[PDB]
Design a protein around this ligand. Structure first.
Ligand code: CLA
Ligand code: CLA
Ligand code: CLA
Ligand code: CLA
Ligand code: CLA
Ligand SMILES: CCCCCCCCCCCCCCCCCC(=O)OC[C@H](CO[C@@H]1O[C@H](CO)[C@H](O)[C@H](O)[C@H]1O)OC(=O)CCCCCCCCCCCCCCCCC
Ligand SMILES: CCCCCCCCCCCCCCCCCC(=O)OC[C@H](CO[C@@H]1O[C@H](CO)[C@H](O)[C@H](O)[C@H]1O)OC(=O)CCCCCCCCCCCCCCCCC
Ligand SMILES: CCCCCCCCCCCCCCCCCC(=O)OC[C@H](CO[C@@H]1O[C@H](CO)[C@H](O)[C@H](O)[C@H]1O)OC(=O)CCCCCCCCCCCCCCCCC
Ligand SMILES: CCCCCCCCCCCCCCCC(=O)OC[C@H](COP(=O)(O)OC[C@@H](O)CO)OC(=O)CCCCCCCCCCCCCCC
Ligand SMILES: CCCCCCCCCCCCCCCCCC(=O)OC[C@H](CO)OC(=O)CCCCCCCCCCCCCCCCC
Ligand SMILES: CC1=C(/C=C/C(C)=C/C=C/C(C)=C/C=C/C=C(C)/C=C/C=C(C)/C=C/C2=C(C)CCCC2(C)C)C(C)(C)CCC1
Lengths: 67, 238, 30, 35, 31, 27, 30, 38, 484, 44, 31, 30
C-alpha cells in the first residue's frame, strides 16, 4: 500500500529519493581527512590564543580588547 | 477656519467633523500686532485649542523631561466662548483677564508605560500681564473631582463613609491619605500667551499659548504631575 | 502570580476542550 | 487606520460575497432528498 | 493566600488527574 | 601616574592582582 | 609578524607531523 | 506502512521496578529536602 | 513490553512522528522561552540600572534578549535607564508573546504530523520501504544553517539591517547595543573583541553554504557509509549529541571566563576580575590620576562612578554563592542603595593601612590590615589576650572619601572593626535587606548558574553520546550475542 | 488638534465610505467573486 | 524556604509517583 | 513544619520498604 500523497511531499520527494546511494571505494575520504586536520589546527590556534599559549601582535586577549 | 465661515455652516454639516473643537483662524489681517488701537476692550469669544500635551517625567538614569503622551479622551479638550476684559497701552503693555465661560475641560492622557494622567485643562480666572508679543500670568486650577465624588468604596469628602467599611478591623492610621481625609485643596497654574495675528477691522486677535499646570491629585493622594499644554488661542475685542 | 494561575487554568480548560473535540473516542456504528 | 479600514472592508466584502454567491450556487439542490 | 492557595490548586489539579490517568491508561491498555 | 606606588598600594589589599603578577621579574 | 610563540607553535605542528609519521613507520615496521 | 501505525509498542513496569522507582523518589526527597528547605 | 526508558524508541523508524516529536519539543522550548520572559518581566525592577542591574535580580533570559538588541519594554522603560516612547513590536514582552504564539503554532504542526505520519515522501521510491536520505538531509540542513549564520552575521550584528549587538567599555560603564564592524585580521580571533562575532558568522556561514552544496552533490563512499552507519538515525543522534556537548563546553567556558559575547553589564562580573584586581586596579589608577593633577582625596573619589565601585565588590563575584542558595543576589545581601565611599585606614603613627581582601575560596576570612610595604600592622584578633595587633592597640581610624560618608572620620574601635570587616569584601555599600528579607549570605550570578547548568549538561551529554555511539556500533548484539 | 483621526463617525456616510478607494475595493471584491462564480457556472 | 520548598517536595514526590503508578497499574492489569 | 516533612518522608520510605518486603512480586520457579 502507498503512503499519503501531498503536493508538498511531491515537491520534496526528489530530496529523499536517493537513500543508500554511495560511491565505490573511499571517495573523498582523503580530502575529508585534510579538512579535519586543518580544522584541528585551527581549533588548536584559537585554543592557544584564548589560553595565552599563543601570543600575537594585535591580540590583547583581555577585557581591554573592548577598548 | 475663520469665525465668519464657521458661523456660515450649519450644525448638521459641522456635526461629527471635529470642527466644533477647533479655534477660529484669522486668515485675513496682519501680523504687526502693535498696529492695534489701545484702550479698554471686552474680551469676547475667547477660545483655546491645544496642539500638544506633554507630561513632566523622570526616568531611571536621572533625566527630567516632558514626554509625549497619547490623548485618551476624544475631541473634548477645547475651551471656547470665554469672556473677559483686556487693557492695551500705547507703549505695548497689556493686561489680560478672563471672566467666565467654558474655561475647563477634563482630559486624560496616557504616558508611555500605560499610566493614566487625568487633568483639568483650565484657564479660569487668568490674570496675565506683559506685552503684546508675550504676556504671562496665573490661573486657578480647581480640583478634578468635586467634593461629592465617591471612590469605588464609597468614601468621599462631602459625602461617604470616611473609612473602609468592608474591613471591620482595618480602617485607621495607615490609610489616612485614603480614608481619613479626601482633600480638595485647589491649585494654581502658569500660562504665557503670545499674540501673532490681528485684524483691526473686526478686532479679532489670535496667537499661541503655552501653559504648565498640575494634574489630578486623586483627592489627597499620589502627587500631581506637571502638564505642559502648547496650543492656539483666538478671541474678539469689545 | 495569580494572573499566571488564572491564565494557566483557562488555557488548560481550553486544551481539554480541544482534545475532547478532535481526539474523542469515535462512535462506532457496530 | 485607513489601511486597517481598507483591509477590513476587503475581508468583510470577501466573506459576504462568498456567502451570497454560495447560496446563489444552486443551494436547494444540495440535499440528499429524493425529488 | 499567595502560596498556600497555589499548592492547594496544584494538588487539586494533579491528584485527581493522576487518579483519572491511572484508570484511563489501564482501560486503554485493555482497549 | 606613579605605577610603582599604585603597585605597592594594590599589593597589600590583593597579592594576586595582575599588576603584581606582571613584569615582576624586574623586581 | 611572527612572534616567538607563533614560531614555536608552527614548529610544534611540524614535530607533531613528524611523530605521527614515526608511529606510522613503527606500525609498518611490524 | 498502513492506516494503523505499525510501530505500536506496549510499555511495561513490574512491581519490583515500581518499588525501585518509589524508593528512588522518596530517598531523593529525603536526601534533598534538607537542602531545599535550607 | 518496552521498558519505560525505551518508549521514545517507537519513533526511530517513523520519520513523520519523529518530525512530530521534534515539533512538540520545539513548541515546549519556545513556550518556555516566552513564559520565562514574562516571569522575568513581571518580577524585574528597572528603576536603578546602576546599583540594581538585571544580574543582581536573578534575570536569566533577560540578558540574552538584551545581548542581541531587545532593550526596550512595553512598560515605558529602557534597559539603559532611558525612556522608551515607542518600543515597537520587538520589546521584551513582544519577544515573549512571539515565542508563545510560535509555541502554539508548533504544537498544531506537531499534531498534524503525528496524525499524518504515513507520507509517501518518507517512502523510498525503489523498494517502497520507509527511509531517510540522511547525507542529503544533512546537506540541506547545513546549507540552511550556513545561510542563517551568514545572514545573522552580515545583517543583524553588523547593523546593516539588524540592530547590532551589545558592546561595552572594558569596565562595563557605557554599554549599549551597537552595530559591529567585522575584524578580518588576527584580532578577529580575540575572544574579547566584539568584531570577531560578525567575521566568524560571515566566514562560517560562507563555509557552511559551500559545504552544504558539497553534501548536496557528492554522495558518501561505501567504506565511510558503513563505518559511520549513515543509514541509521541513531548514528546521527550520537554525532549530534557529541557536537552539542562540545558546544556546551565551549559556551560554559566562554561564559565563565568572559568574552565579548558575555558582557558584565548583562551577566555580572567574572570571578577572575576579582582575583586579578581588574576593577580595583582601574579604580586606583583613576584615583592616582587627578591626584597627580592636583585634586584632594575627598574629590577624585567622588569622581569614581558608583557602578565601578559596585563592580569592585566580592558580593558580585559569581563564585561566592552556593548550590542551594536560591534566587537573586538581592535576596542574598539586600538591594544595594548607596556607595559609602572608599575607606582609608590609618594608625596612631599616621601610616596608611589596607584591608587584606577576601579570596574567592574563603567563606570566612580574618580581618588583616597591612601597610604599604607588606607588613601586617593591625587585625581583629581571634585571641584578645597577649595580642599585639588589635585595632585598640594600634589605634586605627578610618576616613571615607567620595560616598555617603565622604569627609567623615571614625576613631572608635567598635566601628573601625565593622568598617574593616566590610572593606574585606571590597568597596563598602549600604544594602536594603527589609524589602526582600535577605538572609545576609552571598548568592551566585546568572553567569555562574549558566556555567553550572551547562557543564552538568555537557557531562551528561558525553554519557549520552557514549551510549548512542555504543547503540549504533553494537546494534546487532543489542538484544544479546549470537551464541555460536 | 493634538492628534489625527478619520472623523468619519456620524454624518450619514454611504456604507461608511469616507474615501472612494473603499467603495472601489468593495466593488472590486464583490465583482471578482461574482466573476469567478459566473465564469464557473454551468459547471455543476 | 518554608513553603516553596514544601511545594517543590510535594511535586517531586507526586508527579513521578503518578507516572510510576500509571505504568504499574497498566502493567498489572495487562498481566 | 519542616520536622513534619522530614518525619513524613522517613515514614513513607519505611512504608515502601515494608511493602517491598511483604508484598513483593513472588519469585516464580514455574
Ligand atoms: C539552564 C538552566 C537554567 C539556568 C542556569 C537558570 C538560572 C536561574 N534561574 Mg531558572 N529556570 C529554568 C532554567 C534555568 N534557570 C527553567 C527550565 C525553569 C522552569 C522550571 C526556570 C524557572 C525559574 C524560576 C521560576 C526562577 C528561576 C530563577 C533562576 C535564577 C536563580 C538561581 C537558580 O537557578 O535557582 C537555584 C537553583 C537550584 C537550587 C538548582 C537545583 C539543583 C538541582 C536541580 C537539584 C538536583 C535535583 C534533585 C534530585 C531534586 C530533588 C529536590 C526535591 C527533594 C524537592 C538563576 C539566574 C529564580 C529567579 O531569580 O527568578 C528571577 C526563580 O525564581 N528560574
Ligand atoms: C574570518 C575568520 C573568522 C573569524 C575572525 C572567527 C572568529 C571566531 N571564531 Mg571562528 N570559524 C571560522 C571563521 C572565523 N572565526 C570558520 C571559517 C569556521 C569553520 C566553519 C569557524 C569555526 C569556529 C569554531 C568551531 C569555533 C569558532 C570560534 C571563534 C571565536 C574564537 C575566539 C573564542 O572565543 O574562542 C573560544 C573558543 C575556543 C577557544 C574553542 C576551544 C575548544 C576546545 C579545543 C575544546 C573544548 C571542548 C573539549 C571537548 C573539552 C571538554 C572538557 C574538558 C574539561 C575535558 C571567534 C568569535 C569559537 C567560538 O565560537 O567561541 C565561542 C569556536 O568554538 N570558530
Ligand atoms: C524566527 C525564529 C526565531 C527568532 C529569530 C528567535 C529569537 C530569539 N530567541 Mg528563539 N527560539 C525559536 C525561534 C526564534 N528565536 C524556536 C524555534 C525555539 C525553540 C527551539 C526558540 C527557543 C529559544 C530559547 C530557548 C531562547 C530563545 C531566545 C531568543 C532571543 C535571543 C536568541 C539568542 O540568544 O541566540 C543564541 C543562539 C545561539 C547561540 C545558537 C547558535 C547556533 C549554533 C551555534 C549552531 C551549531 C550547529 C550548527 C549546525 C553548526 C553550523 C555549521 C556552520 C559551518 C554553518 C531572541 C529574541 C533566548 C531568550 O532570551 O529568550 C527569552 C532563549 O533563552 N529562543
Ligand atoms: C537530545 C539528545 C537525546 C535524545 C534525542 C535521546 C533519545 C533516546 N534516548 Mg537518550 N540519552 C541522552 C540524550 C538523548 N537521548 C543523554 C544526555 C543521556 C545520558 C543522561 C542518554 C542516555 C540514554 C540511555 C541510557 C538510554 C537512552 C535511550 C533513548 C531512547 C528512548 C528514550 C526514552 O524513551 O526515554 C524515556 C524517558 C522517560 C520516560 C522519562 C525520563 C525523565 C528524566 C529522567 C527526567 C525528566 C527530563 C526533563 C523533563 C527534560 C529536561 C532535561 C533536558 C534539558 C535535557 C531515545 C532513542 C534508551 C535507548 O537507547 O533505548 C533503546 C536508553 O536506554 N538514552
Ligand atoms: C572518552 C572519550 C570518547 C570515546 C571513547 C568516544 C567514543 C565514540 N566516538 Mg567520540 N567523541 C568524543 C569522545 C569520545 N568518543 C569527543 C570529546 C568528541 C568531540 C565532540 C567526539 C566526537 C565524535 C563524533 C562526532 C563521532 C564520535 C563517534 C564515536 C564512536 C566511534 C569511535 C570514534 O570515532 O572515536 C572518536 C575518536 C576519538 C575520540 C579519538 C580522538 C583522538 C584525537 C584526534 C587526539 C588529538 C590530540 C591532539 C594532539 C590535540 C591535543 C589538544 C590539547 C592541546 C588540548 C564511539 C562510540 C563516531 C561514531 O561513529 O559514533 C557512532 C561519531 O560520529 N565521536
Ligand atoms: C522538585 C523539582 C525541582 C528541583 C529544584 C528545586 C529548586 C528549589 C527552589 O525553590 O528554587 C527556587 C529558586 C528561586 O527561589 C527564590 O527566588 C526568588 C527570586 O525569584 C527569591 O530570590 C527567593 O529568595 C528565592 O528563594 O530558583 C528556581 O526557581 C529554580 C529554577 C530552576 C532552574 C535551576 C537552574 C538550573 C541549573 C542546572 C540545570 C540542571 C543541570 C543538570 C543537573 C545538575
Ligand atoms: C438578524 C439580523 C437581521 C435583522 C435585522 C437587521 C436590521 C437592519 C438591517 C439594515 C441596517 C442598515 C443597512 C445598511 C447597513 C450599512 O450600510 O452598514 C454600513 C456601516 C457603516 O460603516 C461605518 O460607518 C461610519 C459612519 O456612519 C464610519 O464611517 C465607520 O468608519 C464605518 O465603518 O458599516 C457596517 O456597519 C458594517 C456592515 C457589514 C455587514 C456584514 C454582515 C452582513 C452578513 C450577511 C448579509 C448577507 C447579505
Ligand atoms: C454582482 C455585483 C458585484 C459588484 C458590484 C457591481 C458594480 C459596482 C460598481 C461601483 C463602481 C464605483 C464604486 C466606487 C465609488 O463609488 O466610490 C466613490 C464614492 C465614495 O464616496 C465619496 O468619495 C469621494 C471621492 O471619490 C469623497 O472622497 C468622499 O469619500 C465621498 O463623497 O462612493 C459613493 O459615494 C457611494 C458608493 C456606494 C454606491
Ligand atoms: C517534567 C516532569 C517529569 C517527571 C519525571 C518522570 C520520571 C520519574 C521516574 C524516572 C525514574 C524511574 C526509575 C524506575 C526504576 C525502575 O524502572 O526499575 C528498575 C529498572 C528495570 O529494568 P528492566 O528493564 O528489568 O525493567 C523492565 C520494566 O518493568 C521497567 O520498565 O532498571 C533500570 O534500568 C532503571 C534504573 C536502575 C534501577 C536502580 C535505580 C533505583 C535505585 C535507587 C537507590 C535508592 C537507595 C539509596 C540508598 C543509599
Ligand atoms: C459599493 C460598490 C458596490 C455597489 C453595491 C450594489 C451594486 C449593484 C448590484 C445589483 C445587482 C442586481 C442583481 C443581479 C442578479 C444577482 C444574482 C446573479 O448575479 O445571478 C447570476 C446571473 C447568472 O447568469 O448573472 C446575470 O444574470 C447578470 C447579473 C449582472 C451581475 C452584475 C455585475 C456588474 C459588474 C460587477 C463588477 C465588474 C466586475 C469585474 C471585476 C473583475 C475583477 C476586477
Ligand atoms: C495552542 C495554540 C495557541 C496557544 C499556545 C500557548 C498558550 C502555548 C504555551 C506554552 C507554555 C506556557 C509553555 C511553557 C513551558 C515550560 C516548559 C516546557 C518547561 C519546563 C521545565 C523543565 C524541563 C525543568 C526541569 C528542571 C526543574 C524541574 C528544576 C531544576 C532542574 C531542571 C532544569 C531539570 C495559540 C493561540 C498561540 C495559537 C493556536 C494554538
Amino acid at each position: 500500500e502507498p503512503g499519503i500523497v501531498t503536493p508538498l511531499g511531491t515537491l520534496l520527494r526528489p530530496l529523499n529519493s536517493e537513500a543508500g546511494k554511495v560511491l565505490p571505494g573511499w571517495g573523498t575520504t582523503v580530502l575529508m581527512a585534510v579538512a579535519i586536520l586543518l580544522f584541528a589546527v585551527f581549533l588548536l590556534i584559537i585554543l592557544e590564543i584564548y589560553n595565552s599559549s599563543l601570543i600575537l601582535d594585535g591580540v590583547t586577549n583581555s577585557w581591554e580588547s573592548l577598548a | 477656519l475663520t469665525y465668519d465661515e464657521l458661523q456660515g455652516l450649519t450644525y448638521l454639516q459641522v456635526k461629527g467633523t471635529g470642527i466644533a473643537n477647533t479655534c477660529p483662524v484669522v486668515e485675513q489681517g496682519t501680523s504687526n500686532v502693535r498696529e492695534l488701537k489701545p484702550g479698554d476692550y471686552k474680551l469676547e469669544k475667547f477660545c483655546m485649542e491645544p496642539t500638544s500635551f506633554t507630561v513632566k517625567e523622570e526616568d531611571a538614569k536621572g533625566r527630567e523631561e516632558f514626554v509625549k503622551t497619547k490623548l485618551l479622551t476624544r475631541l473634548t479638550y477645547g475651551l471656547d466662548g470665554m469672556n473677559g476684559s483686556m487693557k492695551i497701552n500705547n507703549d505695548g503693555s497689556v493686561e489680560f483677564r478672563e471672566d467666565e465661560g467654558l474655561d475647563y475641560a477634563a482630559t486624560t492622557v496616557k504616558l508611555p508605560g500605560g499610566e493614566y494622567v487625568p487633568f483639568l485643562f483650565t484657564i479660569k480666572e487668568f490674570d496675565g500681564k506683559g506685552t503684546l508679543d508675550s504676556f504671562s500670568g496665573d490661573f486657578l486650577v480647581p480640583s478634578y473631582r468635586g467634593s461629592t465624588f465617591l471612590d469605588p468604596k464609597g468614601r468621599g469628602g462631602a459625602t461617604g463613609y470616611d473609612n473602609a467599611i468592608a474591613l471591620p478591623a482595618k480602617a485607621d492610621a495607615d490609610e489616612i491619605q485614603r480614608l481619613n481625609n479626601k482633600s480638595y485643596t485647589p491649585g494654581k497654574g502658569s500660562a504665557v500667551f503670545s499674540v501673532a495675528k490681528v485684524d483691526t477691522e473686526t478686532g479679532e486677535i489670535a496667537g499661541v499659548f503655552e501653559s504648565i499646570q498640575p494634574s489630578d491629585t486623586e483627592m489627597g493622594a499620589h502627587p500631581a504631575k506637571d502638564i505642559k499644554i502648547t496650543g492656539l488661542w483666538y478671541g474678539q475685542l469689545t | 502570580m495569580e494572573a499566571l494561575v488564572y491564565t494557566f487554568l483557562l488555557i488548560g480548560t481550553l486544551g481539554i476542550i480541544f482534545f475532547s473535540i478532535f481526539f474523542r473516542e469515535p462512535p462506532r456504528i457496530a | 487606520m485607513l489601511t486597517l479600514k481598507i483591509f477590513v472592508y476587503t475581508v468583510v466584502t470577501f466573506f459576504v460575497g462568498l456567502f451570497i454567491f454560495g447560496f446563489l450556487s444552486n443551494d436547494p439542490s444540495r440535499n440528499p432528498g429524493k425529488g | 493566600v499567595n502560596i498556600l492557595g497555589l499548592t492547594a490548586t496544584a494538588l487539586f489539579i494533579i491528584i485527581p488527574t493522576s487518579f483519572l490517568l491511572i484508570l484511563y491508561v489501564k482501560t486503554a491498555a485493555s482497549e | 601616574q606613579r605605577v610603582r606606588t599604585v603597585l605597592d598600594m594594590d599589593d597589600p589589599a590583593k597579592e594576586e592582582t595582575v599588576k603584581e603578577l606582571r613584569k615582576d621579574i624586574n623586581n | 609578524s611572527v612572534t616567538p610563540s607563533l614560531k614555536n607553535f608552527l614548529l610544534s605542528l611540524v614535530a607533531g607531523a613528524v611523530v605521527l609519521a614515526a608511529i606510522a613507520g613503527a606500525v609498518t615496521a611490524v | 506502512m498502513a492506516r494503523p501505525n505499525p510501530n505500536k509498542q506496549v510499555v511495561e513496569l513490574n512491581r519490583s521496578s515500581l518499588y525501585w522507582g518509589l524508593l528512588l523518589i522518596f530517598v531523593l526527597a529525603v536526601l534533598f529536602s534538607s537542602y531545599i528547605f535550607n | 513490553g518496552l521498558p519505560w526508558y525505551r518508549v521514545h524508541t517507537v519513533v526511530i523508524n517513523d520519520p513523520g512522528r519523529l518530525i512530530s516529536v521534534h515539533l512538540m519539543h520545539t513548541a515546549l522550548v519556545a513556550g518556555w522561552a516566552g513564559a520565562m520572559t514574562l516571569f522575568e518581566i513581571a518580577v524585574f525592577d528597572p528603576s536603578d540600572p546602576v546599583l540594581n542591574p538585571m544580574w543582581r535580580q536573578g534575570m536569566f533570559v533577560l540578558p540574552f534578549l538584551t545581548r542581541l538588541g531587545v532593550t526596550q519594554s512595553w512598560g515605558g522603560w529602557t534597559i539603559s535607564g532611558e525612556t522608551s516612547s515607542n518600543p515597537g513590536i520587538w520589546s521584551y514582552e513582544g519577544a515573549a508573546a512571539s515565542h508563545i504564539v510560535l509555541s502554539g503554532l508548533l504544537f498544531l504542526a506537531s499534531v498534524w504530523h503525528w496524525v499524518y505520519w504515513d507520507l509517501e515522501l518518507f517512502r523510498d521510491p525503489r523498494t517502497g520501504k520507509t527511509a531517510l536520505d540522511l547525507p542529503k538531509i544533512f546537506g540541506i540542513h547545513l546549507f540552511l544553517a550556513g545561510l542563517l549564520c551568514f545572514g545573522f552575521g552580515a545583517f543583524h550584528v553588523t547593523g546593516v539591517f539588524g540592530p547590532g549587538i551589545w558592546v561595552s567599555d572594558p569596565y562595563g560603564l557605557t554599554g549599549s547595543v551597537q552595530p559591529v564592524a567585522p575584524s578580518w585580521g588576527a584580532e578577529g580571533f580575540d575572544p574579547y573583541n566584539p568584531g570577531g562575532v560578525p567575521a566568524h558568522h560571515i566566514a562560517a556561514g560562507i563555509l557552511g553554504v559551500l559545504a552544504g552544496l558539497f553534501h548536496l552533490c557528492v554522495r558518501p563512499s561505501i567504506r565511510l557509509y558503513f563505518g559511520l552507519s549513515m543509514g541509521s538515525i541513531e548514528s546521527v543522534l550520537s554525532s549530534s549529541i557529541a557536537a552539542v556537548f562540545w558546544a556546551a563546553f565551549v559556551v560554559a567556558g566562554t561564559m565563565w571566563y568572559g568574552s565579548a559575547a558575555t558582557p558584565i553589564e548583562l551577566f555580572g562580573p567574572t570571578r577572575y576580575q576579582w582575583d586579578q584586581g581588574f576593577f580595583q586596579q582601574e579604580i586606583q589608577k583613576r584615583v592616582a590620576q587627578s591626584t597627580s593633577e592636583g585634586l584632594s582625596v575627598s574629590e577624585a573619589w567622588a569622581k569614581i562612578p558608583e557602578k565601578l565601585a559596585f563592580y569592585d565588590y566580592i558580593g558580585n563575584n559569581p563564585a561566592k554563592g552556593g548550590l542551594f542558595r536560591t534566587g537573586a543576589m538581592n535576596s542574598g545581601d539586600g538591594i544595594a542603595v548607596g556607595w559609602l565611599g572608599h575607606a582609608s585606614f590609618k594608625d596612631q603613627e599616621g601610616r596608611e593601612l589596607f584591608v587584606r581582601r577576601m579570596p574567592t575560596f574563603f567563606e570566612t576570612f580574618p580581618v588583616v590590615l597591612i601597610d604599604k610595604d607588606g607588613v601586617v600592622r593591625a587585625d581583629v584578633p581571634f585571641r584578645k589576650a597577649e595580642s599585639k595587633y588589635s585595632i585598640e592597640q594600634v589605634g586605627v581610624s578610618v576616613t571615607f572619601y567620595g560616598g555617603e560618608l565622604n569627609g567623615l572620620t571614625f576613631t572608635d574601635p567598635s566601628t573601625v572593626k565593622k568598617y574593616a570587616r566590610k572593606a574585606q569584601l571590597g568597596e563598602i555599600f549600604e544594602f536594603d535587606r527589609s524589602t526582600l528579607q535577605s538572609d545576609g549570605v552571598f548568592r551566585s550570578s546568572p553567569r555562574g548558574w549558566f556555567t553550572f547548568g551547562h557543564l552538568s549538561f555537557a557531562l551528561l551529554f558525553f554519557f549520552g553520546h557514549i551510549w548512542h555511539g555504543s547503540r549504533t556500533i553494537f546494534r546487532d548484539v543489542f538484544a544479546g550475542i549470537d551464541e555460536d | 488638534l493634538v492628534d489625527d483621526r478619520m472623523n468619519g463617525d456620524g454624518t450619514g456616510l454611504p456604507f461608511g465610505v469616507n474615501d472612494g478607494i473603499l467603495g472601489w475595493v468593495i466593488a472590486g471584491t464583490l465583482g471578482t467573486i461574482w466573476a469567478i462564480y459566473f465564469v464557473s457556472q454551468k459547471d455543476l
